Structures are given as structure tokens and as C-alpha cells.
Amino acid sequence: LEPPPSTFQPLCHPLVEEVSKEVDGYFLQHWNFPNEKARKKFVAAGFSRVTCLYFPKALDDRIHFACRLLTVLFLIDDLLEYMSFEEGSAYNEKLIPISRGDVLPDRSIPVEYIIYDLWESMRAHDREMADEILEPVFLFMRAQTDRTRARPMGLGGYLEYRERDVGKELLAALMRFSMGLKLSPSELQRVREIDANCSKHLSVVNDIYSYEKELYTSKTAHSEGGILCTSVQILAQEADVTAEAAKRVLFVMCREWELRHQLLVARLSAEGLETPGLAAYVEGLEYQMSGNELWAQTTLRYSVVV
Amino acid sequence: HLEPPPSTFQPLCHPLVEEVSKEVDGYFLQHWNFPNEKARKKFVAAGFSRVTCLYFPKALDDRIHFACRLLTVLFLIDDLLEYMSFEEGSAYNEKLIPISRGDVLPDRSIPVEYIIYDLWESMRAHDREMADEILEPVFLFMRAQTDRTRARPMGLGGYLEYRERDVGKELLAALMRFSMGLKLSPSELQRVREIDANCSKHLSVVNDIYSYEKELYTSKTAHSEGGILCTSVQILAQEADVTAEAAKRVLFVMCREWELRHQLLVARLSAEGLETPGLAAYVEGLEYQMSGNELWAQTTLRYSVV
Ligand SMILES: C=C(C)[C@H]1CC[N@@H+]2CCC[C@H](C)[C@@]2(C)C1
Numbered sequence: 001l002e003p004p005p006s007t008f009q010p011l012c013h014p015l016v017e018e019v020s021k022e023v024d025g026y027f028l029q030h031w032n033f034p035n036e037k038a039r040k041k042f043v044a045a046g047f048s049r050v051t052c053l054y055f056p057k058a059l060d061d062r063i064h065f066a067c068r069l070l071t072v073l074f075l076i077d078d079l080l081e082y083m084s085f086e087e088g089s090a091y092n093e094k095l096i097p098i099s100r101g102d103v104l105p106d107r108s109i110p111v112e113y114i115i116y117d118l119w120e121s122m123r124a125h126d127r128e129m130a131d132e133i134l135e136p137v138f139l140f141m142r143a144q145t146d147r148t149r150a151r152p153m154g155l156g157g158y159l160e161y162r163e164r165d166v167g168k169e170l171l172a173a174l175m176r177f178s179m180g181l182k183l184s185p186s187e188l189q190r191v192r193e194i195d196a197n198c199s200k201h202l203s204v205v206n207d208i209y210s211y212e213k214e215l216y217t218s219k220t221a222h223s224e225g226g227i228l229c230t231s232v233q234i235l236a237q238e239a240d241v242t243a244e245a246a247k248r249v250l251f252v253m254c255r256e257w258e259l260r261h262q263l264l265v266a267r268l269s270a271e272g273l274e275t276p277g278l279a280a281y282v283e284g285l286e287y288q289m290s291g292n293e294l295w296a297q298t299t300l301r302y303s304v305v306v
Numbered sequence: 307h308l309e310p311p312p313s314t315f316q317p318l319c320h321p322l323v324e325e326v327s328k329e330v331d332g333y334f335l336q337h338w339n340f341p342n343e344k345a346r347k348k349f350v351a352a353g354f355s356r357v358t359c360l361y362f363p364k365a366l367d368d369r370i371h372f373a374c375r376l377l378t379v380l381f382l383i384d385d386l387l388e389y390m391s392f393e394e395g396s397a398y399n400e401k402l403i404p405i406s407r408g409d410v411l412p413d414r415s416i417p418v419e420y421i422i423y424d425l426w427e428s429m430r431a432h433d434r435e436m437a438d439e440i441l442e443p444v445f446l447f448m449r450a451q452t453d454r455t456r457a458r459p460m461g462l463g464g465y466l467e468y469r470e471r472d473v474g475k476e477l478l479a480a481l482m483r484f485s486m487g488l489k490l491s492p493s494e495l496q497r498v499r500e501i502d503a504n505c506s507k508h509l510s511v512v513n514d515i516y517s518y519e520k521e522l523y524t525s526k527t528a529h530s531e532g533g534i535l536c537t538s539v540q541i542l543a544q545e546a547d548v549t550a551e552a553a554k555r556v557l558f559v560m561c562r563e564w565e566l567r568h569q570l571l572v573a574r575l576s577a578e579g580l581e582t583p584g585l586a587a588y589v590e591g592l593e594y595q596m597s598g599n600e601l602w603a604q605t606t607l608r609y610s611v612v
Pocket residue numbers: 050054070073074077165166167206292
């Protein structure tokens with residue numbers, strides 16, 4: 001697999017090492033890992049590393065929040081593969097009022113008090129910006145177990161669905177929170193088109209590198225929770241080609257989305273519309289795209305199936 | 307300008323392309339009814355016999371002119387149907403069907419009728435058995451041109467399935483065998499179904515990429531039904547949410563994957579000991595179609611000037 005040239009240069013948060021030890025150490029202590037092999041596989045994945053690649057300009061005292069959130073979402077994302085759609089739904093829905101803080105967690109159940117203490121600590125640091133991450137997360141959670149995964153999809157209908165499943169909206173809200181970057185409602189409405197374009201890039205790039213992992217999961221895990229739902233699968237069906245052939249095609253498509261990103265930003269600047277905050281925001285989106293690809297290229301999570 | 311990705315296919319042209327072109331073009335210039343001198347010059351500029359010689363390079367010398375005449379009149383009719391409705395276009399094609407069979411005498415005052423009649427008569431006179439095997443594939447194509455599914459929303463997969471008839475895969479397959487005198491058993495013709503379906507996608511999309519600008523303008527001036535925009539370029543552009551130009555580049559990469567799959571199915575057919583001498587010439591002939599179609603679509607004034 002040889003990716004076509006990109007002009008996006010990845011950046012990593014300077015405190016990636018010490019934050020990784022802090023966050024990984026927290027979960028290694030509280031999260032219920034089945035065995036030592038799973039604990040090693042968890043650390044080898046580098047969940048704090050990809051977070052620092054996603055938000056390399058996050059505030060030094062806020063990056064750990066983003067690392068914790070993505071880490072626990074990664075862990076749950078794997079757990080749902082062994083559940084049914086019904087079981088997965090009940091699992092996620094129980095965490096939602098706990099995320100809001102309306103329901104106290106069962107402190108004998110790790111996933112509950114980890115989720116609870118997280119959002120409680122995020123509200124203590126920045127209450128307003130933390131609340132604006134809630135619903136985007138819930139939107140992503142409820143999309144994970146939507147039965148539309150089991151029904152046939154075209155490329156467009158899939159990309160429209162994956163925008164929720166890849167958590168584009170939560171990642172955007174997390175980025176703002178981590179950077180302290182507040183944007184007016186009108187400002188967010190201007191980059192709505194740029195957000196939708198960024199989502200397709202994050203989704204497909206992930207689909208390309210994580211296909212072999214998700215292929216194996218669909219054959220060994222739960223037939224519903226581990227169902228093969230990816231652009232690589234769908235494009236291979238539509239065009240009747242191998243999955244490897246679909247990857248090469250989807251990669252060219254990703255570069256076109258990068259090209260569109262630059263065009264949409266340029267138009268935003270041509271018109272007197274790119275505010276200083278919007279300038280920082282769209283740069284952050286590029287860091288997400290380039291950071292996602294860098295990590296996906298190198299992370300053990302996608303390279304060792306075992 | 308659009309740069310085509312590398313291909314291993316070497317396009318071939320029939321060695322009698324110069325004489326047959328001047329011959330067939332001369333025939334239609336004597337006989338067909340053109341609105342003005344501008345249309346007469348544009349007809350010659352298209353090179354309808356050139357593409358036929360690129361399609362069927364290893365055709366017999368005394369049969370290549372038949373294919374040039376058939377594809378030429380089908381090209382002319384295809385353009386006429388864009389100024390009609392689906393109901394008018396159907397009535398136009400259906401009246402020419404029993405004439406093609408030879409059951410109904412043509413109106414000698416109407417060019418399209420006696421041109422088609424005399425054509426199929428001369429074809430059955432040269433090789434009755436093989437000429438008859440092109441009838442239903444042609445009718446299948448003619449009835450696909452006014453299929454009301456053109457005014458229906460289609461995904462990439464559904465489009466490619468429909469286009470196999472609209473691009474006239476079978477008629478091009480039967481015409482090729484006729485022009486080469488290549489007879490195949492029903493067993494042989496069944497073994498290469500997958501290769502035919504794969505080749506059909508290549509012919510369709512390659513044509514779509516270069517003829518998009520022509521068909522875009524037709525959709526803006528052409529009759530709303532008969533001139534409706536129906537192409538993979540538009541479909542991928544709206545599904546992936548990119549420009550038509552961006553869709554062309556991605557579709558072109560996909561076409562190269564279909565070339566790889568062609569080589570794959572051919573080698574697999576041979577490895578299973580199913581490749582008869584007649585089948586070797588067939589799958590090679592399909593390659594000449596795919597490469598020949600690309601060469602012509604790159605250089606013809608039919609697509610470059612609108
Ligand atoms: C931050 C990422 C690497 C994205 C890619 C996949 N993961 C899966 C677990 C849940 C995350 C929000 C995400 C969808 C984000």
C-alpha cells in the first residue's frame with residue numbers, strides 16, 4: 001500500500017510522551033482489562049498519541065482531557081464488536097445520563113465512574129465548552145448501534161452515516177475545548193461545508209488502514225456488533241473489484257477532498273469571512289486529517305491483527 | 307487537461323482505417339440528412355469509422371466496413387434521441403427494429419430507414435448466421451436508450467448495471483465476433499460472462515469521463531428527457547461531494563483497476579484450463595475495445611469541442 005502524495009504535514013503535541021504515560025497509566029489502573037496481553041495491546045495502540053496528533057495545538061493543561069475521552073471511546077468501540085445491536089445500544093444509552101451528570105455511576109463498574117469523573121472534571125475546567133461536546137458524543141454513540149449498518153448502502157449514503165460513526169462533530173467540539181477556541185454560532189455555520197468535507201477524509205483514511213482488522217473482526221466476533229461496515233467494502237461492491245483495489249481508488253479520492261479543503265478555505269478567505277478563530281479552526285481540521293493518516297499508517301492497532 | 311494514469315494496454319487500429327473511413331463517411335454524406343454544412347463537417351470530425359477500427363483492429367478486411375456503418379448510424383441516432391422524449395425516442399427505435407430484421411420494407415424517402423435496411427441486408431448476405439446474432443443485442447441497446455430508469459436516481463452500482471445495455475456491451479461483442487468471423491460455442495460464451503461485465507464497466511466509465519462536457523451541455527439545451535444527464539461522473543461527484551473534474555480523476559484510477567481485473571480473470575480462465583483458442587482471441591479482442599475506446603475518446607473532436 002503506497003499512498004499518493006499529500007501536502008498536509010502532520011503535527012504532534014509536545015507533551016505527547018508525559019500525557020501518554022498519565023492517561024495510559026490511569027486506564028491500566030481502573031479499566032477492566034481481561035489479561036496482560038490485552039494490556040500490552042492497549043498501550044501498543046497509542047491512543048494518547050493519535051489524540052496529540054489530532055489536536056497538536058491543544059492547551060497544555062487540556063490535552064489530557066481529550067486523551068481520556070478518545071481512549072475510553074476507543075475501548076468501548078472495541079467492546080461493542082462482541083455485542084449485538086440491542087446489547088450495544090443498552091450499553092451506550094446507560095452511559096449517556098452518566099455523561100450528563102444526571103445519574104451517579106456504579107463505582108464497582110469501571111466504565112461508569114470513568115465516564116462520570118471525566119465529564120465532571122471537564123465541566124470543572126471549562127463548563128460551557130464541555131457541555132457542547134455532550135450531544136455530539138451522544139450522536140456518535142447512537143450511530144454505533146444503528147441498524148442501518150446491516151442494511152445496504154451506497155458510497156454517499158455511507159459517508160453521510162459515517163460522519164456520525166466517525167464522530168466528526170465530537171472531534172470538532174473536542175478540538176475547540178482542548179484549544180479553548182470559542183466560535184460564534186454564525187462562525188460555525190460558515191465552516192459547515194468544510195466540516196462535512198473533513199469528515200469524509202477522516203472516515204475513508206481510517207477505513208483504508210483499519211480494513212484488515214475489521215475484516216477479521218467480522219469473521220470472529222459478533223455478527224452484528226462486528227459487522228463489516230466500511231467504504232472499502234462498499235466501493236468494492238459497487239465497482240465489483242477487490243478490497244485492495246478499492247483502497248487505491250479511495251486514496252486518490254482522499255487527495256481530492258484535501259484539494260477541496262484548500263479551495264473551500266481559499267474562498268472563505270477571498271470573501272471577508274475567515275475570522276482569526278476560523279483560521280485556527282480550519283488549520284486544526286487539517287491537523288486532524290494529517291494526524292489521522294500518520295497514526296493509521298504506523299499504529300500497531302491496524303498492523304497486527306492478532 | 308486531464309492526465310490518464312498508466313496503462314499496460316496497447317491500442318491497435320485496423321490497417322484499412324483510411325480507406326474504410328473515406329468510404330463509409332462518403333456513404334453517410336451522400337445519404338444521411340444533415341441540417342447544415344456545419345453538421346456535415348462535425349460528422350467527419352468525429353471519426354466514427356476511426357473508433358470502429360480502434361474497436362475491432364483484427365477484423366477481417368472484407369467485414370470491417372459493416373461494423374463502421376452500423377456504429378456510425380447508431381451514433382447518429384443516439385444524438386437524435388437527445389432532442390426527443392422517451393416516448394418519441396422509443397417510437398423512433400421501435401419502427402427501425404422490424405426493418406433491421408428485414409421483415410418490413412423501408413421508406414425510401416426516409417434516410418434512416420433504408421440505410422438500416424440495406425445495411426442489415428448486406429450483412430446477412432455476407433454472413434447470415436453471425437449477422438442474425440447481432441440483432442437482439444442491438445435491440446437490447448436501442449430499447450435501453452429510452453429506458454425510463456434514466457430519469458431515476460441511481461447509485462454507482464445500479465448505474466453500471468444499466469449502462470451495460472446503454473453502452474451496448476453485447477452488441478459490441480457480437481459485432482466484434484462478426485467482423486472477425488469469430489464463432490464461439492454457448493459454453494465458451496458463458497465462461498466469459500464476468501470478463502464481459504468487467505469490460506463493460508471500463509467502456510462505460512472511460513466514455514463517461516471524456517464525454518461529460520458534451521452531455522452536460524446537452525442536458526442544458528437538449529430535450530429534458532432525451533437529453534437528461536446520466537453518467538458516472540455526475541453520480542460519483544454528488545456521492546463523494548466533489549467536482550466533476552475530481553470525479554474524472556478518481557474514475558480513471560478505477561478504470562485501471564478494471565484493467566488489472568481483466569488480466570486477472572483471463573489468467574484465471576487459462577489456469578483453469580478453460581481458455582480455448584477461440585476464447586483467447588475473444589478476451590484479447592475485448593482488450594482492443596477498452597484501449598481503442600480510450601484512445602478515440604482522448605482525441606475525437608466529438609468530445610473536445612462542444
Ligand atoms: C480519533 C480517531 C483515530 C478517530 C478514528 C476512530 N475512532 C474510533 C473510536 C471512537 C473515536 C471517536 C474514533 C471514531 C475517532
